Design an enzyme around this catalytic site. Structure first.
Site, PDB file in Angstrom:
ATOM      1  CD  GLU A  36      95.050 151.899 -36.576  1.00 48.48           C
ATOM      2  OE1 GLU A  36      95.397 152.944 -35.993  1.00 48.48           O
ATOM      3  OE2 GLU A  36      95.838 150.967 -36.822  1.00 48.48           O
TER       4      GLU A  36
ATOM      5  CG  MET B 282      82.546 175.163 -26.057  1.00 48.65           C
ATOM      6  SD  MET B 282      81.035 175.908 -26.709  1.00 48.65           S
ATOM      7  CE  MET B 282      80.990 177.478 -25.848  1.00 48.65           C
TER       8      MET B 282
ATOM      9  CG  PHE C 298     103.401 140.599 -30.752  1.00 45.96           C
ATOM     10  CD1 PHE C 298     104.040 141.662 -30.134  1.00 45.96           C
ATOM     11  CD2 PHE C 298     103.339 140.573 -32.137  1.00 45.96           C
ATOM     12  CE1 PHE C 298     104.593 142.690 -30.882  1.00 45.96           C
ATOM     13  CE2 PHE C 298     103.892 141.595 -32.892  1.00 45.96           C
ATOM     14  CZ  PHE C 298     104.520 142.655 -32.263  1.00 45.96           C
ATOM     15  CD  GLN C 299     101.043 144.328 -32.905  1.00 47.00           C
ATOM     16  OE1 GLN C 299     100.626 143.709 -33.882  1.00 47.00           O
ATOM     17  NE2 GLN C 299     101.479 145.580 -32.982  1.00 47.00           N
TER      18      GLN C 299
ATOM     19  CE  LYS D  73      98.682 135.675 -39.023  1.00 46.05           C
ATOM     20  NZ  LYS D  73      99.895 136.535 -39.098  1.00 46.05           N
TER      21      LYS D  73
END
Ligand SMILES: Cc1cc2nc3c(=O)[nH]c(=O)nc-3n(C[C@H](O)[C@H](O)[C@H](O)COP(=O)(O)OP(=O)(O)OC[C@H]3O[C@@H](n4cnc5c(N)ncnc54)[C@H](O)[C@@H]3O)c2cc1C
Ligand SMILES: Cc1cc2nc3c(=O)[nH]c(=O)nc-3n(C[C@H](O)[C@H](O)[C@H](O)COP(=O)(O)OP(=O)(O)OC[C@H]3O[C@@H](n4cnc5c(N)ncnc54)[C@H](O)[C@@H]3O)c2cc1C
Ligand SMILES: Cc1ncc(C[n+]2c([C@@](C)(O)OO)sc(CCOP(=O)(O)OP(=O)(O)O)c2C)c(N)n1
Ligand SMILES: Cc1ncc(C[n+]2c([C@@](C)(O)OO)sc(CCOP(=O)(O)OP(=O)(O)O)c2C)c(N)n1
Ligand SMILES: COc1cc(C)nc(NC(=O)NS(=O)(=O)c2ccccc2OCCF)n1
Ligand SMILES: COc1cc(C)nc(NC(=O)NS(=O)(=O)c2ccccc2OCCF)n1
Ligand SMILES: [Mg+2]
Ligand SMILES: [Mg+2]
Ligand SMILES: [Mg+2]
Ligand SMILES: [Mg+2]
Ligand SMILES: [Mg+2]
Ligand SMILES: [Mg+2]
Lengths: 582, 582
Positions: B59, B485, B121-122, B171
């Site tokens: 993602e 760097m 959950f999640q 959802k």
């Protein structure tokens, strides 16, 4: 059905939609103080024929009056203030309602939506300020949301654990025209899905079983039982368990009853704290185990099985870890347990007369006591005379301090919602405005504000409200010329070193200052002062018999101490039972 | 008009309402990675015939691709993730888009509304997590709000100062049936009322007047000018003022032009920083005076009158206090000033050829320089060869580090939105996914990811995305086997004491590790490695001529240093112009 003053297809101002939303909730009284940001709401109020406004003289008076209205009736109290300085004057009342679980809906005007965040005229972010001292709050951002938000606010304020809800309404939303939709569904899916269910017979029979296995049960009753006096009284019939009450629970079980151990905690009776100390079963119904009650938590009910029934799951196990717990309405739990007790009565053979006799020995050796010095008026005596002359049927509101404790100890409240007192926050200035709200909600009742001289002067401006609204509010002012409760702690723990607790004039030390009679005079309220104990009974009788408002200035020796006293964080073995400031 | 796939009276899922809301915004591409809480959205996407989904492999790749899409096109980038671990993987991209003012709309699935707050959950509170790293965000609590919120999200992401907006969608709202209302008015009264107005002729003529009174003017151009290349170029014709650009502004004014001072700041050219140091008029158009550019603020443009034109009033006077300010769109300010300059041309008699000649002396004494050691490939040279072989017309994206600075210094960007680089946050792993988004938005362009070996491996999994989507992404990997760097700062300030900056395998110290060619091989992407400077030109030519994706591993000596360097917080007198790690 409900009859609107507007056609279903007729647009009207948001202010008119908000007032009709209150009407559709059954609101009949509000406490509203006008300002620029709420002028539209006040105009819409004058168009309502079913809602009365009681104009306070200070918004703190408005919110405290809404509290008294709520606490004395079971209905939500509604106060309304303008933006900025009006809204900030509500803050003490919101915190007070949250700590004591009082249902309350506060509406504040707000600057126009586009002005929010720009340091506009009379703008404060009241939703941010009050987020941690309200149960919930709202900032209305569309006129179409007014029906839904008002409905949700009343639902949240009155369901579950009650509490204050603040609704902030920008002035441009008040002026916008719209056609309301009264059929909108509320948006509280999480809250509504986590609402406690009626208690299971599984949990209820385990409790009745635990009662039969116990020898020293004590009921521990608090503010959560205010709607359960019948169920609780029936429960005590079937079990014979003695009842110890918190400051917030006074009157749930009658004080004059023989099974009553009266108040427990820091200034509770020796015998109530004795019972909890030596109990083997503690029935904690509608209580939150606060530090004024428990003292050192490890020592509180240290040898008892603890049953805790609370409607707020977050309270169960917060300070004291129970053995058994029921998360639900104590009213239903009592009803269920009463059925079990009725049926299985002869199989249970409940008799605690041996424990009761042990407690009644403590009740005889250590009763509540006060001393009478010459002709000086004992404050304890004054409250007892008020109890007799009113037959224990008066609604009582108080300030905070020694007079509050004495009003708790020496008045026998027979029903809940006679006792209106700030317990969790303990805000001075509560007594007079609270009496205003209680009188409006109970027009035929005897309403008495048992106030202290420091507490009474904090919101003395509400005397004008009492006169203008012609409310029969009685003021029993216990005047000790000191911040009495702080003075008592100076005596006990700081060698009587006075640090700004004297409220009189040091230039005229032996003069009652100020003259509360002239405060009553300024507002056209009859008043009198009594100094000699011989005159007290007729003085109180005069106050009661004189129609309308009345102030009685009761002079009292300041060296009195509230007893007994378990020092903060102490145990039962630390209780103080003697001494004063003499 | 717009044609919906549903009847105006036909209820459909909220997920279908959300996708049509995207269609009604002109969205054609999204970067969406499916999970449980967003399955409904993904099902609704397959029903759309006008929206393509590019499935990333991470993602963070999805959001970075949406950034590349946005930065290379001017359109908002749209990424979609599931709840919990999907949403948290967006976080670096949201912060990156906010710091660089990139328009972006991020949609996250969320657990059902009633589950929110229960550690479901999640579940993560993504609206709380991202509040300080997004321009605005939403938690949708009703399916009826989807049209309005999506419209507001795109409006906020793309208007004013652009930025990311996150929309969190539970959802259960995705599954609820409803009939959308596409006519709802947005609820942004404060934001819309504070939108900058077109600049007044009052302010614009004061600036043109200040130009004529000045002898050493310098244009200071940044990311705010990306839509003003025509107006800016016309402005430079009429005034002959030399142009210094920030890292974010590269290409607003063409780099190959004679009036171009190239980049200023910490790694800016000596002559660009010279101009700003000795200017008397600083035209700061679309810049935010960041610390990489200014150094010690008191010394930055210490003897210049500062004109600051910014669309964000909060930026004007934030770090450097201007003399004159215009809060508005720099595109309009340029158009207005160009008219004044055209008319009053002969009355103004603008000629800065003496100042220009002073700067061109600095441009000849201190040009950008690099050294060639034997047959080793200088990274600076590799980028210059890429410029030539692509004629400066390639879209360039980069990682972060030395290769980023070299890609800024040695490529002559002719138009804005050729340069896609993370400037404010400086997030490694940006280059490869950003190239993915730029290629999807510009299918006919040459797209090259000039990446470092540390940056490239961070999101190497997006090679699978490039193959599956058949995108002609070229990877010019400047491989110095180090975190270059940070290595350079170790050399300068820590006596070359290596603290975990070596990215190879110490067991086989002289072997290129890892083998990036096999990463490309795993995903079916042709690749090659070049080590000798003699082979470089044909190698790059092969990469360009080979159709489709291609990775070129360019081995470079690690002791190179980016020059020049004004140390952090330093002044122009502290500039470093020589040295490396040898
Ligand atoms: C100067 C001063 C001295 C004080 N000293 C004392 C003292 O000596 N003794 C004393 O008792 N207090 C004292 N207090 C008061 C005190 O600080 C608290 O207000 C009080 O002790 C707590 O009341 P409570 O335990 O009944 O809980 P409350 O504050 O009344 O809250 C009610 C509880 O029951 C629950 N509940 C509500 N409704 C229901 C329902 N339908 N079913 C089940 N549960 C429900 C709520 O979740 C909450 O847990 C004093 C206050 C002051 C100002
Ligand atoms: C390793 C590294 C080294 C770096 N060294 C340098 C360096 O030597 N030199 C350098 O320049 N950068 C350097 N940076 C990049 C840097 O940290 C900043 O991203 C950059 O300097 C700031 O760009 P900016 O001034 O153009 O403002 P931006 O971040 O591009 O924001 C645009 C500004 O214009 C305004 N604006 C937007 N739209 C409009 C409009 N339509 N009209 C008017 N105003 C508008 C916005 O409000 C904002 O103030 C480096 C970055 C990295 C990672
Ligand atoms: C708004 C407010 N300010 C100050 C308070 C701090 N307290 C008290 C306490 C216990 O809460 O201290 O913790 S009680 C008290 C003194 C009460 O003066 P009285 O009204 O005359 O009654 P009495 O019969 O003489 O005792 C003070 C000053 C308070 N609670 N509220
Ligand atoms: C997610 C992330 N993690 C660590 C970072 C800290 N930095 C850098 C810096 C300047 O931001 O430090 O402030 S640059 C850098 C090393 C770059 O390795 P390279 O890709 O090989 O490129 P090169 O051509 O060799 O230099 C690191 C480790 C970063 N920015 N992003
Ligand atoms: C002495 O000024 C007074 C006095 C009285 C009695 N009323 C008002 N009313 C408004 O000014 N209304 S307002 O246009 O919507 C408004 C605009 C900007 C900021 C705030 C604001 O409202 C503040 C509420 F007062 N102003
Ligand atoms: C292995 O479990 C999986 C696997 C997959 C592919 N999908 C889901 N989907 C749900 O569980 N949907 S849910 O009923 O609305 C739900 C209920 C409670 C908490 C969260 C929640 O959603 C979380 C999103 F996954 N579960
Ligand atoms: Mg058990
Ligand atoms: Mg007596
Ligand atoms: Mg007092
Ligand atoms: Mg001037
Ligand atoms: Mg060369
Ligand atoms: Mg490297």
């Amino acid at each position: 059905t409900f009859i609107s003053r507007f056609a279903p297809d007729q647009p009207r101002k948001g202010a008119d939609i908000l007032v009709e939303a209150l009407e559709r909730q059954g609101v009949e009284t509000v406490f509203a103080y006008p300002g620029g940001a709420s002028m539209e709401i006040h105009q819409a109020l004058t168009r309502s024929s079913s809602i009365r406004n009681v104009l306070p003289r200070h918004e703190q008076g408005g919110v405290f009056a809404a509290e008294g209205y709520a606490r004395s009736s079971g209905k939500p109290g509604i106060c309304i203030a303008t933006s900025g300085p009006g809204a900030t004057n509500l803050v003490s009342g919101l915190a007070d309602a949250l700590l004591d679980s009082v249902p309350l809906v506060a509406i504040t005007g707000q600057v126009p939506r586009r002005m929010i965040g720009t340091d506009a005229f009379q703008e404060t972010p009241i939703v941010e300020v009050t987020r941690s001292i309200t149960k919930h709050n709202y900032l209305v951002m569309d006129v179409e949301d007014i029906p839904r938000i008002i409905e949700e606010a009343f639902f949240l304020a009155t369901s579950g654990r009650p509490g204050p809800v603040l609704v902030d309404v920008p002035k441009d939303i008040q002026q916008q025209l719209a056609i309301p939709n009264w059929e909108q569904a509320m948006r509280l899916p999480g809250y509504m899905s986590r609402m406690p269910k009626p208690p299971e017979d599984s949990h209820l029979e385990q409790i009745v079983r635990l009662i039969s296995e116990s020898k020293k049960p004590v009921l521990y009753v608090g503010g959560g039982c205010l709607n359960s006096s019948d169920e609780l009284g029936r429960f005590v019939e079937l079990t014979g368990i003695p009842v110890a009450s918190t400051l917030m629970g006074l009157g749930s079980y009658p004080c004059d009853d023989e099974l009553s151990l009266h108040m427990l905690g820091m200034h509770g009776t020796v015998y109530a704290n004795y019972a909890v100390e030596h109990s083997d079963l503690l029935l904690a119904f509608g209580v939150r185990f606060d530090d004024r009650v428990t003292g050192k938590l490890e020592a509180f009910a240290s040898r008892a099985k603890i049953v805790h029934i609370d409607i707020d799951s977050a309270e169960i196990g917060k300070n004291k870890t129970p053995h058994v717990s029921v998360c639900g309405d104590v009213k239903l739990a009592l009803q269920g347990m009463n059925k079990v007790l009725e049926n299985r009565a002869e199989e249970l053979k409940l008799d605690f007369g041996v424990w009761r006799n042990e407690l009644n020995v403590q009740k005889q050796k250590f009763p509540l006591s006060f001393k009478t010095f010459g002709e000086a008026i004992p404050p304890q005596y004054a409250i007892k005379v008020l109890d007799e002359l009113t037959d224990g049927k008066a609604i009582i509101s108080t300030g905070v301090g020694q007079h509050q404790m004495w009003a708790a100890q020496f008045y026998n409240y027979k029903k809940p919602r006679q006792w209106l007192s700030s317990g969790g926050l303990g805000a001075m200035g509560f007594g007079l405005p609270a009496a205003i709200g209680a009188s409006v909600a109970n027009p035929d009742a005897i309403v008495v504000d048992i106030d202290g001289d420091g507490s009474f002067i904090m919101n003395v401006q509400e005397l004008a409200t009492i006169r203008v609204e012609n409310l029969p509010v009685k003021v029993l002012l216990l005047n000790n010329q000191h911040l009495g409760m702080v003075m008592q702690w100076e005596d006990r723990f700081y060698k009587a070193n006075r640090a700004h607790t004297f409220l009189g004039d040091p230039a005229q030390e032996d003069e009652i200052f100020p003259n509360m009679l002239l405060f009553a005079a300024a507002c056209g309220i009859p008043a009198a002062r009594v100094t000699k104990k011989a005159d007290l009974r007729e003085a109180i009788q005069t106050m009661l018999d004189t129609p309308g408002p009345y102030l009685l200035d009761v002079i009292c020796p300041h060296q009195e101490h509230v007893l007994p006293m378990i020092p903060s964080g102490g145990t039962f073995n630390d209780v103080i039972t003697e001494g004063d400031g003499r």
